[PDB]
């Protein structure tokens, strides 16, 4: 709940400061177009003022001197009227002197003008200092999504990360670029708007700071008691969606078992309390402005009342009533946006802080460069004892030896330490206290790179990302044709069923009709582990979902054939792996027993008796 | 962007003398916002220009009523926008959530369930959240510019050509760059949404991207998407930077020509000059209107794709209804018979199904089997319409499935799909919904045939455990057996399994299987998998492979009959 604030602000200004050239051009040239848009009212009312001081002395007797006049003024019972003409600066019998006017009114004009190129040069460059230090966050953000470990992955919620780095970057957006356009001026129109409304009457001016209080007061009551509603329809909408999502994800249960009329019931009963509820939530931060407007009037009426009686009794000049109300009606409007000024820099702020906690934590080992070259295969484990947190031991000691060109296999019941074995394999996580050696060299001081790229792996879950299904099977190897693509995608038997989708290898698997199960997506990912023509081929549960003789002949055409290559394969039936070279049973690490079929059948241990519960029926 | 106002005028139907107590509160807020520097205007004049001192005090009264009346219109517009801007987005989820319960799985699937949910939950937001902004904070410009014109002809109608003329180019040169800026602007959120779309991407398949080593790749196609949308962000803020500086000259300008020309009128003395102070907050308060007005012209871009979306989902025409005749057999026991059943994409090369053929009897068990993707999945939908035969036909006892009610067949078919779906509550609810009227033993019947009591007994309040969402708590194999106990209470005439047994071990799929053919002595059932065992004991077995059946028989007649059921037995054995 933004832990740091001050730090927080220092650091987001920080990222800034590479542009400090085009953030002072934005700063000053702010601050002289503002201060420009202030003076003008000044002037055009010295234009309005040298219009009333010929307009109502023009009638007065000629010859008649302005002291003269007041006296005469005064001595023929018009006291107020004589205290007004002894306010300005009048001469009898003459005129509304146009070339004045004029003047004033080219200087007006000009600095008018002036004060239009100088604020859209400012937002240019504005722009331009916002979308060029975003690039850096958004690039940075990129460049260590790319050297953290998984470690950091795995341990958080479902959505955490991703709106760390998605949601949570437009915040710092709109945070940024509302502090230093919709912020930086709307102080400035507080700072000099009141040092120039200073300068006329110091009097009217405290009509209007006394309203300062009064709205903050006002924005803020209605803030904190438009609260238990803002989080009561939030809360709402949460619960519209956990059943608009058991709804739409169930549907084949909800259209069967024929509860279509019970799942619209609870959604109608849900949907009406919840328009009720984000009623009050608008209704009460919309009633935000016409209450912070009626204290911006309740000062102006004040304001040119004063004026008003002040001008009357001659203490003030009506030209600069004429620029006081525009500047009231200016200092007014910083105020009838300052609480969704405040509480978009303030949610702005607190979704900074996790990308620069994201950016915060430490890096991956810093890799060694080697680039290993696996020539057969020799991936002997020498005593692995991995572990996630110090305390629980998942993998115990263990040596598993395997022949340059053999196929060893692992089996084992649920959770034994076989995915966070593969896991150990690919350098994902690091070993405790044990020797991986691939082909003799270790890999503990290997680059990953060379390693990774090496090995060749799938896994039990699928991942597709946005784009055709030849761009799926090609993302093994990017520089293949189509003829190697397909020729190396036959193999995996992923034709079978695309050539049956409405457009083949152009499905676009990432808004599908849902034409592809989740055998025919692993399909997919062996196809684009073939791709890659792998050395040291792993795969983790790839064939669970896909027919158990598809999984036979692929496995024998690509890893039973491939002399030269050698494999790990993972996988829970035991009539995929039976007769493959070395199988091991693993229960929580802790290998039980090794060896081929036969040796392994004909001794009764842990293999014997778990065929029994996978062919004998017995459990 | 013509689907918004299409989508927009339908659902806001009732809420026009709602809108209109909203458009006339609008007026009455803003006649007496311009009408304040009306009666400064009455004091500069009839309390300044003579002494009158009383006039001024007299009527600051007045300032005061119409401040007031300003304000107890402007509070009870924001209370009539925000309540019919929030039954339309109510009554527009009620009616897409409405028609999308209409889908049948061919096109539910065809956009998901979370591009379906963002499509209904907050898709709707966005122009929910438009129409309570452009009823109380955008319609105030025109009704402001309007009002001013209106006020300036009303007072020294003689100068009010100024505002007939600083109005129209006002609205005309903001209505430029807002046409050069929309398509610009609505190009950004399109690839905004596909950069998004690439880090979840990333992010989704951290692992298999580091398992190629293939991050080269990234951080480089994502390099081409960073610096376009920066390049079609900083094209849309090249335009939004003279919305400000040509609003404000134009009405500073405006400003200026008036005191001149009106200093032309006050010289020949048809004129005063407290006329000049109204007319100056006249323009003021359009350019505070007009800026207020168009800095959030973002909604309508972020707004148009949102109801495009939204109206792809109302526009999807269904084609699996009930018939205009629908037949109503007194039992629909289970006797199917699928002939010539064939189903093919739009525009597919090959179909799923081509000619299928079989007949199961009264209360046998036939058993479908074949490779992965070779037509298998769709035979279980087909039998209870979540798709539609293309050139087939299967029927049930009496009639065709289409020329059937949808709801009576629903009504006596047990069906397991691939997935296991378990809705949030509790397991005396979640497995409720096979017979919605069971009694508490008859629960536990189900769960004692399932497999299922080993983990629903073993609780402190029987059964009463509460369940996960999607009853991820459950993990495999007790996810699929609460589904299976599900539709064990039914007292289905057809059960359906389609891949239930797949997570089960062999030693409880026997005993679900003794369990039922000891309980389901007469109601047929169809078991769709990829396994042997579970298949030796059906009564009839057929191998279907890439679509067309190759085989039809028992599991002995067929072991020796046909190459692809003998090697598909073959890795089976121990
Ligand atoms: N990165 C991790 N952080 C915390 N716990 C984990 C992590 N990876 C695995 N586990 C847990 O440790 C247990 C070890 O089982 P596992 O090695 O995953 O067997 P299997 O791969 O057969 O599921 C699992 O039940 C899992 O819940
Ligand atoms: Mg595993």
């Known amino acids: ?619 | 962007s013509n689907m918004l106002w299409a989508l927009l005028r339908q659902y806001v139907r009732p809420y026009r003398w709602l809108l209109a107590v909203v458009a006339v509160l609008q007026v009455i807020s803003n006649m007496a916002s311009l009408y304040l520097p009306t009666v400064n205007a009455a004091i500069i004049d009839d309390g300044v220009a003579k002494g009158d001192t009383a006039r001024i005090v007299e009527l600051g009264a007045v300032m005061l009523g119409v401040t007031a009346l300003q304000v107890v219109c402007a509070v009870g517009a924001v209370f009539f926008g925000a309540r019919a801007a929030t039954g339309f987005g109510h009554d527009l989820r009620a009616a897409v959530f409405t028609h999308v319960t209409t889908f049948s799985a061919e096109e539910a699937g065809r956009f998901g369930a979370a591009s379906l949910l963002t499509r209904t939950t907050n898709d709707v937001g966005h122009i929910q959240q438009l129409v309570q902004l452009t009823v109380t904070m955008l319609i105030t410009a025109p009704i402001m510019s309007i009002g001013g014109i209106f006020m300036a002809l009303h007072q020294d109608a003689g100068l009010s050509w100024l505002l007939l003329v600083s109005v129209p180019v006002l609205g005309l040169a903001n209505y430029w760059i807002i046409r050069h800026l929309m398509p610009v602007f609505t190009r950004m959120q399109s690839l905004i949404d596909g950069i998004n779309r690439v880090l979840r991407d990333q992010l989704s398949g951290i692992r298999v991207i580091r398992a190629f080593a293939r991050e080269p790749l990234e951080r480089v196609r994502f390099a081409e998407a960073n610096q376009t949308l920066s390049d079609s962000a900083l094209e849309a803020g090249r335009w939004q930077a003279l919305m400000l500086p040509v609003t404000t000259l134009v009405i500073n300008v405006s400003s200026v020509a008036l005191i001149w020309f009106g200093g032309l009128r006050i010289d020949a003395g048809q004129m005063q000059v407290g006329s000049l102070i109204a007319f100056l907050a006249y323009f003021m308060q359009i350019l505070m209107a007009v800026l207020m007005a168009t800095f959030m012209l973002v909604i309508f871009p972020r707004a148009a794709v949102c109801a495009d979306r939204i109206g792809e989902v109302l526009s999807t025409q269904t084609a699996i209804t009930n018939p205009a005749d629908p037949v109503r057999p007194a039992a629909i026991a289970g006797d199917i018979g699928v002939h010539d059943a064939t189903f093919c994409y739009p525009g597919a090369d090959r179909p799923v199904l081509q000619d299928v053929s079989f007949t199961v009897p009264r209360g046998t068990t036939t058993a479908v089997v074949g490779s992965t993707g070779s037509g298998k999945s769709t035979l279980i939908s087909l039998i209870c319409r979540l798709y539609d035969v293309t050139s087939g036909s299967l029927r049930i006892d009496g009639v065709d499935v289409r020329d059937l009610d949808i709801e009576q067949l629903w009504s006596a078919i047990g069906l397991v799909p691939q997935r296991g779906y378990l809705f949030s509550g509790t397991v005396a609810e979640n497995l409720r919904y096979g017979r919605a009227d069971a009694t508490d033993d008859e629960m536990w019947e189900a769960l004692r045939v399932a497999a299922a009591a080993d983990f629903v007994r073993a609780h402190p309040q029987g059964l009463d455990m509460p369940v996960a969402q999607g009853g991820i708590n459950f993990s495999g194999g007790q996810r699929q057996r609460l589904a299976i106990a599900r539709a064990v209470i039914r007292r289905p005439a057809i059960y359906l399994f389609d891949d239930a047994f797949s997570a089960l071990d062999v030693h409880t799929d026997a005993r679900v299987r003794d369990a039922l053919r000891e309980v389901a002595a007469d109601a047929t059932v169809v078991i769709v998998s990829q396994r042997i065992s579970t298949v030796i004991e059906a009564d009839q077995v057929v191998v279907i492979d890439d679509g067309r059946v190759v085989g039809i028989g028992t599991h002995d007649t067929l072991l020796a009959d046909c190459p692809i059921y003998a090697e598909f037995a073959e890795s089976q054995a121990l």
């Open chain 1, 1 to 619: 709940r933004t832990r740091d604030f001050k730090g927080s602000a220092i650091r987001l200004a920080r990222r800034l400061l590479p542009q400090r050239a085009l953030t002072l051009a934005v700063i000053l040239l702010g601050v002289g177009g503002i201060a420009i848009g202030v003076i003008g009212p000044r002037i055009l009312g010295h234009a309005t003022d040298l219009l009333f001081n010929g307009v109502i002395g023009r009638e007065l007797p000629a010859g008649l001197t302005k002291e003269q006049a007041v006296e005469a003024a005064r001595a023929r019972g018009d006291g107020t009227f004589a205290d007004l003409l002894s306010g300005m600066d009048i001469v009898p019998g003459q005129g509304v002197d146009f070339g004045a006017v004029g003047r004033t009114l080219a200087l007006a004009l000009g600095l008018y003008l002036v004060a239009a190129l100088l604020v859209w040069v400012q937002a240019r460059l504005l722009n331009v200092t916002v979308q060029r230090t975003m690039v850096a966050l958004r690039a940075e953000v990129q460049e260590k999504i790319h050297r953290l470990p998984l470690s950091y992955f795995d341990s958080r919620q479902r959505g955490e990360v991703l709106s760390r780095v998605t949601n949570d970057v437009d915040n710092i957006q709109n945070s940024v670029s509302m502090t230093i356009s919709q912020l930086l001026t709307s102080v400035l129109t507080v700072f000099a708007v009141l040092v120039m409304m200073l300068t006329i009457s110091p009097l009217l001016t405290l009509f209007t700071v006394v309203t300062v209080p009064a709205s903050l007061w006002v924005t803020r009551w209605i803030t904190r008691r438009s609260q238990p509603l803002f989080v009561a329809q939030w809360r709402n909408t949460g619960r519209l969606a956990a059943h608009l999502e058991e709804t739409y994800s169930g549907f084949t249960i909800v259209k069967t078992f024929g509860h279509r009329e019970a799942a619209a019931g609870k959604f109608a009963e849900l949907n009406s309390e919840t328009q009720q509820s984000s009623f009050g939530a608008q209704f009460f931060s919309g009633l935000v402005s016409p209450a912070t407007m009626f204290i911006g009037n309740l000062s102006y009426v004040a304001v040119a009342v004063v004026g008003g009686l002040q001008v009357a009794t001659g203490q003030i000049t009506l030209g600069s009533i004429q620029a006081f109300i525009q500047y009231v009606r200016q200092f007014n409007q910083p105020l009838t946006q300052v609480a969704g000024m405040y509480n978009t820099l303030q949610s702005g702020i607190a979704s900074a802080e996790r990308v620069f906690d994201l950016l915060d934590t430490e890096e991956e080992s810093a890799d060694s460069p080697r680039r290993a070259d696996v020539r057969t295969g020799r991936v002997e484990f020498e005593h692995v004892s991995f572990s996630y947190v110090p305390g629980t031991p998942v993998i115990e000691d263990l040596s598993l030896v395997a022949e340059p060109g053999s196929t060893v296999a692992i089996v084992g019941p649920t959770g034994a330490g076989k995915t966070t074995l593969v896991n150990l394999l690919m350098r994902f996580y690091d070993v405790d206290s044990g020797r991986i050696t691939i082909d003799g060299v270790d890999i503990a001081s290997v680059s990953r790179e060379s390693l990774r790229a090496s090995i060749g792996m799938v896994l039990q879950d699928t991942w597709l990302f946005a784009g055709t299904i030849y761009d799926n099977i090609a993302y093994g190897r990017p520089d293949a044709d189509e003829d190697e693509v397909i020729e190396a995608a036959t193999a995996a038997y992923v034709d079978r069923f695309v050539h049956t989708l409405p457009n083949g290898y152009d499905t676009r698997v990432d808004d599908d009709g849902g034409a592809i199960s989740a055998g025919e997506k692993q399909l997919i990912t062996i196809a684009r582990a073939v791709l890659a023509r792998p050395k040291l081929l792993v795969l983790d549960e790839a064939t669970s979902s896909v027919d158990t003789r598809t999984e036979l002949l692929i496995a024998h055409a690509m890893a039973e054939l491939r002399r030269d290559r050698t494999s790990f394969i993972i996988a829970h039936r035991l009539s995929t792996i039976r007769d493959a070279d070395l199988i091991l049973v693993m229960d929580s690490g802790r290998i039980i027993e090794r060896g081929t079929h036969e040796e392994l059948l004909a001794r009764h241990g842990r293999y014997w008796e778990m065929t029994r519960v996978h062919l004998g029926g017995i459990k």
